Amino acid sequence: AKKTPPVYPVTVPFLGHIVQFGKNPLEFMQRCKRDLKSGVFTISIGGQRVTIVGDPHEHSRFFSPRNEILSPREVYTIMTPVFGEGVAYAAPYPRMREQLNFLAEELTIAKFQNFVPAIQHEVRKFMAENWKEDEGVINLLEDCGAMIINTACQCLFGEDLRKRLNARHFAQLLSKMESSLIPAAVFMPWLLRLPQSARCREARAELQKILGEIIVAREKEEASKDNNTSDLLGGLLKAVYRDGTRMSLHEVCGMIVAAMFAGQHTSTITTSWSMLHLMHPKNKKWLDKLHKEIDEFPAQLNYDNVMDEMPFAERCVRESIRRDPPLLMVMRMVKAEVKVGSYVVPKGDIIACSPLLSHHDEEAFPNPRLWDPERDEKVDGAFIGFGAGVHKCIGQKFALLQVKTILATAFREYDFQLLRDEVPDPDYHTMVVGPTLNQCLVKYTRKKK
Ligand code: HEM
Ligand SMILES: O=C([C@@H](c1ccc(Cl)cc1)c1cccnc1)N1CCN(c2ccc(C(F)(F)F)cc2)CC1
User: What residues bind heme, as annotated?
Assistant: First the structure.
């Protein structure tokens, strides 16, 4: 407009749109976009301009520019004490970038050969421990939460580390470290100034020492040559920066935390929703097609099995992520002016792009609330559940590898029944959204012949 996108009327100032938003971000966001008559628009939040990019045709405008034009650092300040100053965003873009590459090289399909069997074993344990009986009632959001942390550690943690730490203890440190997070923290740069840092630094420093000790070990076993291991930790130790330096224990600790928090809720939600959708009677044909896919697999899967021969199960997981994205907003700080469609975005704005809003556009996704694994985006790029462009998730392959394997293992040895009429409602209260906890009670039936 030789100017900014349309602005949205504030009835009660100094809050902005903070209240109807928190209740239902989706109901709210859709209202504006229609009423504004524009898929792109600014909202006020605490006197802070927030322009949401909600016309799928424009995602490229959001995801393509460099960090110097659209900076992620600022919206993500709420992460530094969980990762450490100078790690991830706190770290400067050259080194932040460097760091992500390290982690990236650890999560590549190269290192995934032992992963598919490692996952099968660790899921199969859990089932025998908690799904003991012929029939029972468990909470799926909680059981997934535990299977996810279990198999990931089984994958990315070395035997020595997993001995002197277990999944459950580490998960309890994830909860301890994270819970300092309030969603509405990222929208007042004074609130960086805790009744919770002083449990966060304790859980980190407990962890960072433990890892330090673990490193003492491996070195005084290197000349000994007892074993060969290349886990995420060991991978990061061998890490060398461009300028020949290496990661301090603190950076390394944070990166392992960052990797682990990163995947923790997102994929456990993802696994849950998928399970929820599939177990529903409205969705049997899909479960049926799911079975004609996992039916002539042997009880022990290889990397080939999940990767190249489960294409339909991939669709289910993506549709779950499409329908109910776990990260609703992705955000940047508009350091410089960027043109969006027929608008401009002024230096100083907060530009956001919402997987939640986007996945709901009717052109791109007809019946957006209908779960359809065979659906395909009808605008190209509509789906941004793993983000896009410069910042596409690096955990995508891994997340899918887990979830596909889990569904397959778990639907091979069980049936399921939702103790409800309708699939859970998304709970929009957490910074990472999943299905409502208290609705996820489900009843398993151990398959037999
Ligand atoms: C289904 C599970 C997951 C979902 C839905 C998901 C979603 C996303 C999204 C939306 C972004 C982009 C955020 C942005 O644009 O600012 C992203 C980036 C990322 N995710 Fe994930 N993620 C998942 C799993 C994981 C896992 C398992 C890891 C680690 C192994 C991980 C680590 C990352 C990293 C490092 C980025 C990089 C963003 C950047 O370049 O700064 N995620 N993910
Ligand atoms: O921690 C992450 C990333 C992530 C970035 C870097 C690294 Cl090294 C690891 C993880 C993330 C979290 C979960 C899955 N994938 C990436 N966040 C945390 C901040 N995020 C976020 C989520 C929601 C909101 C809010 F409140 F506006 F809706 C604002 C920010 C989404 C991205």
Answer: 393
Residue having the nearest C-alpha atom to atom 23 of ligand 2: 431
Cβ of residue 387 lying under 6 Å from some atom of ligand 1? yes
Nearest atom, ligand 1, residue 390 CA: 40
Q: For ligand 1, atom 18, which residue shows the shortest CA distance? A: 393
Distances (CA, A) of 139 to 21, 168, 187, 436: 28, 17, 34, 11
Residue 444 CA to residue 137 CA, distance in Å, equals 7
**182 CA to centre of ligand 2 in angstroms:** 13
**Contacts for 276-285 with beta carbons within 8 Å, 24 or more apart?**
276/140, 276/418, 276/423, 276/424, 276/435, 276/440, 276/442, 277/316, 277/319, 277/320, 277/371, 277/423, 278/316, 278/407, 278/411, 278/416, 279/416, 279/417, 279/418, 279/442, 280/418, 280/423, 283/371
53 CB less than 6 Å from ligand 1?
Answer: no
Provide the experimental method for this PDB entry: X-ray
Ligand number nearest to the C-alpha of 101: 1
Q: Which atom of ligand 2 is nearest to the CA of 83?
A: 8
Query: What residues contact 188, with CB distance under 8 A and at least 6 apart?
Result: 46, 48
395 pocket-lining for ligand 1 (C-beta < 6 Å): yes
Q: Which of 273, 250, 260, 51 is nearest to 148 (CA)?
A: 260
Q: Kind of pairing, strands 350-353 and 48-53?
A: parallel
Facing residues of 43 across strands? 50
The CATH number of domain 1-449 is 1.10.630.10: yes
Pocket test for ligand 1, best of 111, 393, 403, 431 (most atoms within 8 A of CB): 393
84 and 251 in contact (C-beta within 8 Å)? Answer: yes
Distance 422 CA to ligand 1 centre (A): 29
Q: Is the CB of 186 under 6 A from ligand 2?
A: yes
